[PDB]
């Protein structure tokens, strides 16, 4: 029973925003979630609960709002939390992968000593939408040896195709709510 | 005991010569993440300090300092709200500017998240000059918001933070600090 009830409140409490960034978009806004004390430490004991049991041994999560639901679960699960982000803001030796923007390309970087050949990664973000960030974090972290077949998600909008898209490249994704539309 | 737990976390934080330019040794909270037990220690002492303190919010800019505001605030048990580069909040903001070495640059706050009553906890993860906390508490009390403490794992003391941050009426407390600029 709790769990169920969490999860509705959970979703009540992330507020639609029409036309956000553009219009016509119904914008799902995490921001609301993060503000009412009580939803958000639900969202972190559930995605918590759900990896108690799970072997990772470490969480990754991509800057910036990724690393607000990553890093307590970590704290939670008693893992290190490795951040991927932009270039530029890690100091030690890092390796990158690109991936596709709407016009252009971008760049996610790790530390290449984060992640080991024994490593079982969860990977932990905001939002699913339409899964490039996360396939690009998935590359860097196999890239150095890591398994990751797992990540967990706040919200899915799964007519972006992003679950579609990571799960047949072998991640079991497993997100709290979902939203229809785009 | 209590120091053994704060030369813990310090001993978990790395030190990488001559980045970004010679002559700096970068204090890279990246390690101390990486290690669960220097992590939740470290949440654990700022949480623990502020307990009494009657704060009602905690507010962390992006992006390093969501990693040690929002733990903060799950811990307090209080809401956690976002300080944003321009362009990503969803909602009605209100914006300052801060400098950077070259030129300025600016962070956003939703109007809605603060208001009066309430007192806010600003924290980072490191205070190098503190441009960017000058400019949250100035967003902070522009919407009502009372904020007298900033709370920092690091602090780089030779670079002036906590005396301009003192001139703004903001009490700042770190858990260790290194040398150098
Ligand atoms: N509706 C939406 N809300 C939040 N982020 C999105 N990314 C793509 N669509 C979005
Ligand atoms: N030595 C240092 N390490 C990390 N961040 C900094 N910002 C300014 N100086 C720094
Ligand atoms: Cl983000
Ligand atoms: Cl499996
Ligand atoms: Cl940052
Ligand atoms: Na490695
Ligand atoms: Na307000
Ligand atoms: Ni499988």
Same mark, same amino acid.
């Given at each position: 029973?709790?769990?169920?009830?969490?999860?509705?409140?959970?979703?009540?409490?992330?507020?639609?925003?029409?036309?956000?960034?553009?219009?016509?978009?119904?914008?799902?806004?995490?921001?609301?979630?993060?503000?009412?004390?009580?939803?958000?430490?639900?969202?972190?004991? /559930?995605?918590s +609960?759900?990896? %108690? !049991? *799970?072997?990772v041994?470490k969480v990754?999560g991509?800057?910036?709002?990724?690393?607000?639901?990553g890093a307590p679960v970590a704290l939670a699960l008693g893992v290190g939390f490795v951040?991927?982000?932009?270039?530029?803001? /890690?100091?030690? +030796?890092?390796? %990158? !992968? *690109?991936?596709?923007?709407?016009?252009?390309?971008?760049?996610?970087?790790?530390?290449?000593?984060?992640?080991?050949?024994?490593?079982?990664?969860l990977?932990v973000?905001?939002?699913?939408?339409?899964?490039?960030?996360?396939?690009?974090?998935?590359?860097?972290?196999?890239?150095?040896?890591?398994?990751?077949?797992?990540?967990?998600?706040?919200?899915?909008?799964?007519?972006?195709?992003?679950?579609?898209?990571?799960?047949?490249?072998?991640?079991?994704?497993?997100?709290?709510?979902?939203?229809?539309?785009?």
């Amino acid at each position: 029973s709790k769990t169920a009830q969490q999860l509705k409140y959970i979703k009540d409490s992330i507020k639609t925003i029409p036309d956000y960034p553009k219009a016509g978009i119904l914008f799902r806004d995490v921001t609301s979630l993060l503000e009412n004390p009580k939803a958000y430490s639900a969202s972190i004991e /559930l995605l918590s +609960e759900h990896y %108690s !049991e *799970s072997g990772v041994t470490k969480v990754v999560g991509t800057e910036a709002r990724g690393f607000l639901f990553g890093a307590p679960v970590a704290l939670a699960l008693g893992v290190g939390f490795v951040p991927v982000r932009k270039p530029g803001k /890690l100091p030690r +030796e890092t390796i %990158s !992968e *690109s991936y596709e923007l709407e016009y252009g390309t971008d760049t996610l970087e790790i530390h290449t000593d984060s992640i080991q050949p024994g490593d079982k990664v969860l990977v932990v973000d905001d939002l699913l939408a339409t899964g490039g960030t996360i396939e690009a974090t998935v590359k860097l972290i196999r890239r150095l040896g890591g398994e990751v077949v797992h990540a967990a998600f706040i919200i899915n909008l799964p007519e972006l195709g992003g679950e579609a898209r990571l799960t047949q490249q072998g991640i079991h994704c497993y997100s709290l709510v979902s939203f229809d539309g785009h």
